[PDB]
Amino acid sequence: MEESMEELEALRRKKFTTYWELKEAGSVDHTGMRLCDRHNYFKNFYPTLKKEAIEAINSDEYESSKDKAMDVMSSLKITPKISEVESSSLVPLLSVELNCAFDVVLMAKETDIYDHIIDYFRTMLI
Amino acid sequence: IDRYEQVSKDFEFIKI
Amino acid sequence: KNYGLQHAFKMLEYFKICRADIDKPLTQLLNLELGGKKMRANVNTTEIDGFLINHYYLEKNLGYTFKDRRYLLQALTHPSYPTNRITGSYQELEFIGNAILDFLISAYIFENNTKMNPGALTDLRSALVNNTTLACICVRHRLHFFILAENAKLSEIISKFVNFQESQGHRVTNYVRILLEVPPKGEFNMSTNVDVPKALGDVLEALIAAVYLDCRDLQRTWEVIFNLFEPELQEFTRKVPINHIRQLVEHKHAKPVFSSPIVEGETVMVSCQFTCMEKTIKVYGFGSNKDQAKLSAAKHALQQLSKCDA
Amino acid sequence: EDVEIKPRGYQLRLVDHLTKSNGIVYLPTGSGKTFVAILVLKRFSQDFDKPIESGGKRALFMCNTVELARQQAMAVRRCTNFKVGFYVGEQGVDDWTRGMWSDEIKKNQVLVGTAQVFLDMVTQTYVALSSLSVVIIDECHHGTGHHPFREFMRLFTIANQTKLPRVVGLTGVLIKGNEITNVATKLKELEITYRGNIITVSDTKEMENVMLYATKPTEVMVSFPHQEQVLTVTRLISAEIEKFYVSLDLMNIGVQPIRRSKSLQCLRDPSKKSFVKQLFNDFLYQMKEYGIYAASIAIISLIVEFDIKRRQAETLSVKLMHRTALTLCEKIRHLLVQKLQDMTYDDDDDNVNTEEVIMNFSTPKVQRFLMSLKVSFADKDPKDICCLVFVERRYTCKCIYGLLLNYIQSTPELRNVLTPQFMVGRNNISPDFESVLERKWQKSAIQQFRDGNANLMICSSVLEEGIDVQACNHVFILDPVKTFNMYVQSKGRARTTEAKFVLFTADKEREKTIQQIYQYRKAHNDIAEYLKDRVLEKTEPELYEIKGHFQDDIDPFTNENGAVLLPNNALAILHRYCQTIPTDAFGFVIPWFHVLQEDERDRIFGVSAKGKHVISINMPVNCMLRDTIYSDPMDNVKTAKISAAFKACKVLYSLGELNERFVPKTLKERVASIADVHFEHWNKYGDS
Amino acid sequence: GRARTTEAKFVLFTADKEREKTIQQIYQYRKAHNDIAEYLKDRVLEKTEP
Amino acid sequence: NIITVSDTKEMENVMLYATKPTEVMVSFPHQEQVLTVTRLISAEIEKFY
Amino acid sequence: IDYSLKRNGKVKPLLILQKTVSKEHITPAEQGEFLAAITASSAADVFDMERLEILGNSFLKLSATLYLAS
């Protein structure tokens, strides 16, 4: 049997990228595209997912903006890790990581972190 | 505003 | 072996290893005074107890009760801790404690393991006295809480290591974490060695030296040391630990093969392939350099074989 | 026309004067400025071949920076046959040993290096003052305060005056700061600090002979309008950055060392938080100063800075904080570029879009700057043009460099004429916008400019002085000049004749700037006339004034071995000692300085300490010292801190921590001191 | 280069334990070839002689 | 100084004789197990040495 | 004979400490023990110095440490 030369380099790089990713749980570029241009990553999503995300981000039928944000992000198959971060603040300081082929983590209080990501998506897609 | 206000196209180099 | 330490001290000056002093004959060296102004015994006990919160809990876990707590404060103060002004760091006490613990362990194994041959005997001595065993002992007895230190890196490493030990049940197993193939399912077996903080072992050794200096009864120190080391003493005699590369090479049926180290960025990749239960298995080790990667691959291989025996 | 440069008549006259009496040499820019120094060094080269012990003198060339020290070293190697050595801190000079240090002093007849290295070398008795022949101080203007030049020349007071070498005050400018008021007394202080008077050109044909090397470039003022209105997006990014600042002050990363003011009066944020706050504040400054497109380029640079800091960070809290900073940097970039692009639908030609945004997403400052570029270098010879851009801050260099690259690609006329480049001094920043983890272009920016590879050099006060560069065709002073010497050296950078030297100023701030320009011109004229009319044949200071200029500071402590503990170097010595103590990566800790409260000060030192400051130092626990040294009561915080460091260093020397050469004892020294006590019996076998 | 024909097959024999090292070496060689070709494509010199 | 072809037309002309081969890799199951006879010859050779 | 070599709860108090503190547990220095301390492992003899060498090593290390600390 014979094996081609390129398909194996694609596998050695997969080896190392997988180790990098599992070691720290992020900070490895899966977009792999232009280092300046990955800023447009959210703008380049598929039109139907972006359409339903915009519909939900401008929606008001959702009685709270929390599940509003969940619907907007789930339109893009996002997966949140909401976690508390140790802080001197009396009101707890909250963390959320959205996960993508890109790394995005946001700081705010539990009272407004959902708003702080809602307006984030509003910036991204509009 | 929305724009940066433009300037003249013919400024000069002044002996100082 | 025949005339005890008191008499044995004299042959060192007979062999001119040391130089005798008029005030300090060598046979009195067991009466080691912690002299100098680096230590101050004038401090009232309440000042030490201000640092030493949960003192009774620590004495209960250690199995010994101090009668001069200042030595404990010297043993617990990591050198990065700045707000202690009555004692030196634990380095001075750890220096003595290393020798004390090593000598007592060697004497015990010499007395109680005449059956097993000298090469394996010194292998057991090295395996038992090494840093990582002392660190695991320190974790298992919850001694790490009482270390006085101010450093983000050291505290982070200590927390990660104690969490790993809790995940392992505080047993002294191979210090390796497997990342892929409860570990998540995937397609590639990957592993990396666990980082061990020297501070845990050093503070334990300094604590042993502090116990000696407080009691002066070497038998009391041995009582404490045996109470600490009894489970690992019982386990190690049945299976003497050796460095994992040789432990896999010398294995009867593993027959390992190690790949050349691959470098990408600064992480180094080494793969190992070995037969296991009539099935071939390949594991990939990663580390900051080639030797650590080989150690991680060997540790993962040993874990795989040990669990595949059942 | 000879390969060997010929000494000129005026140069030989100056060399003869310096041989007769030491002093300060004030000359305009040129290769002859260093040629005169080379000639003076060659004049006293008689005793180079003799060994040091037999009194064979040596030549010392002390410099302010490493780069100009390298330039002078290579110049004196190329113009002389004498053996010359190069010594900077980064070469590992300190780990050298007395034996090979002495034999390299033997080998190299001339020594060139930075000021601090030679100061440490002389304080450690590696060379005696009598062992030197000429001590050249180029950039003589740097003799301000506790600069190594001034303390080094204070050190001359210890040895016998007969043994002292000849000092040469090479300089291109005399005034250092904004000390225009009574220039005469400032230069009197300078020529008392130095042990000779200033010599310069006075005769007309002398000035013309200097013009055989030097030039007199002209200067032109270019002015631009300013307006205070700002865009909505400016306020939006401002509000987002302020919210992030709040969330970062409440980040609560792990425990960090306490940072306090220079006077230890008030607390400061940890270095990790202060670094990112500095980054974002500088970004806002660039945003408000150079336009929103410049803001896009600056935010792109912040992307790579946060990427590398996150990659190299270790603490999980620091990792997360860097990740949040990068994420918000991306959001800010997105708002900026989305605002840019919705307006960027009137035209779609990317050349025209780039030109339009550079014309209209930018402040009038940058507009007039680029207009000066286009009217200056429209279609000229790329070889003909050779210009410098001088800016305030380090990140402004990258911002301007990227903007000018994008405008060159946005200008068909300037498309192939201009080759921009940037470089900044220490606290260097990753010179890229793409996180290029590996590059092979090993040629430095200075070499590229020297060889003509880059016809434009953008810099923040790093190319202004000392560096060896060609006669630049033009100079652009983007930001207003703050200091007299800065203006003098900047105008000297346009060393070609009929050059273009531009002062970019606001239309609304013409009066203050022009009055500053007359103030600087008046200062220069006063310097010239003072050097013409004021002269005395004594030419050297007297002993009483020599000691008066240096009797103010605390007396240094000197050993019978010959080493001297400089009070101003006490802090450096002590902090070096504290560096070597720990044997663990996590065990490093700096000494805990403290200022005693007035009630504490009184109850400790009586009423005699009233009106004076006291600074206590507590050594790290691992060190043998634990006595809480108290400083002598002094007038100010800095003096008390220096006194505390000096006293602590004296105590450390007394208790054997220092090797009588005032460096901390190495492990080898301790084991050697113990060898005879414990390892003497190795002698019978021919070993130690 | 010795395989001078159309549809020439060039075969390398490598051990399993040396495969990845050989792969890194081969792609380093290819990168060197590409970079030297790019350098000759990019460089411009005036004298054409030393 | 080195001269070389640089035109894209020259690039597409160079293929006339610079035909590169497709390069492929064969892996084999490396193993150290060997019969005792090799050890026997090794012993004889070292004894003879 | 050294069969160990291949070519052929209340803790129990250590004997070394017991004879260090007291004088009634003293034992004579055996002739055979000295011979074993002289017989290197290079010689094919049935006993070697290695086992005594370990304990000597630990004792020497401890004594040097205590002397330096004092």
Numbering used by the authors:
A (entry chain C): 186 to 311
B (entry chain B): 344 to 359
C (entry chain A): 1379 to 1559, 1594 to 1722
D (entry chain A): 2 to 689
E (entry chain D): 493 to 542
F (entry chain D): 198 to 246
G (entry chain A): 1035 to 1042, 1169 to 1230
Sentences copied from the publication:
In order to investigate the effects on DmDcr-2’s function in the ternary complex during siRNA generation, we constructed the DmDcr-2 mutant (D1217N/D1476N, DmDcr-2DDNN) which exhibited no RNA dicing activity but possessed helicase activity in this work. To mimic the substrates and products, we designed and transcribed two dsRNAs, one with a length of 50 bp and the other with a length of 19 bp. From the 50-bp complex dataset, we acquired two structures: one in the dimer state with two DmDcr-2 molecules at a resolution of 3.72 Å, and another in the trimer state with three DmDcr-2 molecules at a resolution of 3.74 Å. In the dimer state structure, the model of dsRNA could be well fitted into the continuous density; however, compared with free dsRNA, we observed significant distortion. The 1st and 2nd DmDcr-2 are linked by this dsRNA, and there are large angles of tilt and twist between the two Helicase domains. This decoration pattern along dsRNA suggests that DmDcr-2’s Helicase domain can adopt a head-to-tail arrangement. Interestingly, when R2D2 was introduced into the same system, the arrangement of the two DmDcr-2 monomers transitioned to a head-to-tail configuration. This indicates that R2D2 plays a distinct role from Loqs-PD in the complex, as it can alter the aggregation mode of DmDcr-2. While dsRNA played a supportive role in the dimeric state, the DmDcr-2 monomers in the trimeric state exhibited much closer proximity to each other.
